[PDB]
Amino acid sequence: LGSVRWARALYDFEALEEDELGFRSGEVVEVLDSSNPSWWTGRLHNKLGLFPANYVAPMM
Amino acid sequence: PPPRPTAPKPLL
Numbered sequence: 826l827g828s829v830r831w832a833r834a835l836y837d838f839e840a841l842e843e844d845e846l847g848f849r850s851g852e853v854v855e856v857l858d859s860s861n862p863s864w865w866t867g868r869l870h871n872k873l874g875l876f877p878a879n880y881v882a883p884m885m
Numbered sequence: 886p887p888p889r890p891t892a893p894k895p896l897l
Binding site (some may be wrong): 835837838841844858862863864866873874875877879880 | 887
């Protein structure tokens with residue numbers, strides 16, 4: 826499936842809605858779901874949420 | 886950064 830399990834933040838992402846996982850550039854995000862082309866699901870610092878797929882670099 | 890996505894978000 827080519828799923829992404831980890832991704833590096835390329836840019837800062839500010840969460841503007843309650844379902845969003847914000848991060849700063851360079852942070853390594855755990856990717857839980859990479860199948861939606863726009864919004865991926867991740868975990869970071871014990872927070873779960875959605876973030877833009879093209880804001881990160883899949884690792885490995 | 887790039888523009889935010891505008892697609893509807895899936896549920897979690």
